[PDB]
Symmetry: C3
């Protein structure tokens, strides 16, 4: 990018609060604020090098925790019962996540950076693998940017959790809206028991770290369909309606009974006047 | 390549006819000609930049459609009931598929080309996700070449559709024949309910866009076994018998009960005299 | 690497003996020595260009064979009943595996090398696809090094075989030990009926051939979770505790009922004094 906005260098030390709470309908969610928990939990986005101190508070009546993929954490912040890293009811604990930039090691080899599309979830509700917590909605996305990564206009999180999208009832979305030409980022995560295949009409991306081709030398497959299983995460960016125009573009699990049973949503791409060809 | 044949630049405007018909045994297939429908449907192969206008005719007594992966289409050619893009019985509709070359966008980023191994299928028979159409045989392969892509001697399509290969009865192939040294292209597609793993004896390929390593810098895994789920597509080329000689080489799903129940075929690689060591 | 040990050029002609035997508890395993069979079978590791002649002896009362992924073999060493390549009870057969370096073909294209993480298993016990042999433990890892590949301090093999890790009873590991800073290689293989997702706490790797990023230009996704199905194999290296320190780090299938039912182990990373923070 040379006109798109790109990520700066980290790393700052950042602090934030998270809460786990039971929702009125029986679900459980994370939130940055007591009373404003969501499923998925809020996006946490940092730059390679950042350190994040999370003051986590379990407001529920059962033990709960916070476990992250991909990022550096000491065993103190594992989020597991086994290393006494979870949180008693009403309790409070400070988790620490660090991230690093890539570079040469002394042995001459190349250390990978932390950058990528990751996620966090509970590891102790219902079972010692968080099966109950995850089923109830205790998951959320984490993005770590490499210096110079292209930044989007908007980021959406899509989570295939067992037979639901974002724990929603069958055939109730979510739907997302964009205007032709928007740079839209998708963070796609899978949880539970089943494998799925994520499919998007009218759009495609690269099957690599960023979902974007670096330039003509990148041999990564360009795809519009990807098989995923529990705790897989990936992400990409697309230009809404690029080459295809406005429309009510479906995304869905392409497993046939899954889409049939409601794992379907809409990517609503609008003309500037806000209209969508052949929609309602 | 510098002696293998390679793809030219597109794009021309191309026209063709497709038909959907019910087959005598209950299946449904696509064809370029009325009376000559097949499962899989015919290969459609174009060059990046080409535009294809498909005059599609539903000869069946139920609504049917044509939905493509990967290629650019306006929402008019979605192939879905939702955007009134399917076709009434006996009806005729012109779908339009476009393809583009990669290149710089104004923001300085890199737009991916359309090139790759794709497929088309019905989206409205039986359910609004084409579950019935796909089960009955309404699928086929699409290949889009990048300028300079290596062209094969022959292309074969292998479709894992639920528990069948190409809708065939258990243990009935298909089998494919080559002579030692042939450049054979495989287009491999999955449909239905189940995940599979595609495996080939005696041959391997690169897990990237083309299935071929560009040269020594490509870090892609070289494989002979790949997990696939519904609506996944990939493709590759191999040199028949390279380093291994002639033989009756099995390919199969490596899921153990699947191969046991008949998801097996033969890649028959022959010496010039047409004989195969230790075969029949 | 420029201080890590790296692989030399092959290829030598190497000979070895393998045996298949029934174990006292009903399982079946491979071994380099009669009486010392294991599940997984012993690691076989060679350099690109090597040739390996394996004098294989079936010590069991049923026919059995040796089938390899990835490596060059003539149809004589297919390991299948179909090409009369298996071994009668008490019988002995010499299998031959070859490997090649990458390079230009005459047509100007690039031939892939044999290098990668592969495996071997039976193809005739119980069924003609070795379903019984594989279930009983007749599998093992094969590594083929490219010249200049980084060599590890230790290699561990993790095999998801149906609902077991390395055919072990639920919740019995295996556990592996390292000291902070060790270069640990993992060879991960899946067998049987089911898909799994392999997950490691505190560590991540590159999703390419070697599991290592070549340098800053490699766009491969960096991951800590990977979906695998029957007969998939991959491998990687990590630095034990890099950025995270010592600890009892879990690895497990992330399919929720699988981890719940016991597909869990420990990567025990120790301080030099041998202690592990918050472990026992
Ligand atoms: Cu875990
Ligand atoms: Cu699904
Ligand atoms: Cu589609
Ligand atoms: Cu997890
Ligand atoms: Cu669709
Ligand atoms: Cu299968
Ligand atoms: Cu094989
Ligand atoms: Cu589709
Ligand atoms: Cu086989
Ligand atoms: Cu599993
Ligand atoms: Cu984890
Ligand atoms: Cu195999």
């Amino acid at each position: 990018g040379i006109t798109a906005r790109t990520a700066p260098a980290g790393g700052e030390v950042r602090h934030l609060k998270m809460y786990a709470e039971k929702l009125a309908d029986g679900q459980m969610g994370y939130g940055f604020e007591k009373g404003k928990a969501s499923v998925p939990g809020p996006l946490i986005e940092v730059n390679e090098g950042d350190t994040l101190h999370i003051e986590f508070t379990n407001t529920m009546d059962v033990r709960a925790s916070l476990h992250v993929h991909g990022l550096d954490y000491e065993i103190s912040s594992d989020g597991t019962a086994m290393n006494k890293s979870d949180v008693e009811p009403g309790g409070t604990r400070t988790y620490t996540w660090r991230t690093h930039k890539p570079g040469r090691r002394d042995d001459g080899t190349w250390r990978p950076g932390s950058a990528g599309y990751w996620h966090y979830h509970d590891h102790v509700v219902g079972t010692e693998h968080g099966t109950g917590g995850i089923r109830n909605g205790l998951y959320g996305p984490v993005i770590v940017r490499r210096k110079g990564d292209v930044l989007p206009d908007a980021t959406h999180t899509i989570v295939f959790n067992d037979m639901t999208i974002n724990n929603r009832k069958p055939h109730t979305g979510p739907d997302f809206e964009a205007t032709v030409g928007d740079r839209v980022e998708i963070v796609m995560i899978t949880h539970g028991e089943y494998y799925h295949t994520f499919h998007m009409h009218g759009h495609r991306w690269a099957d690599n770290r960023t979902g974007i081709l670096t330039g003509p030398d990148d041999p990564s497959r360009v795809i519009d369909n990807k098989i995923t299983g529990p705790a897989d995460s990936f992400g990409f960016q697309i230009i809404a309606g690029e080459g295809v125009g406005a429309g009510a573009w479906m995304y869905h699990c392409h497993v046939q009974s899954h889409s049939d049973m409601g794992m379907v949503g809409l990517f609503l791409v609008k003309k500037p006047d806000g209209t969508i060809p052949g929609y309602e």
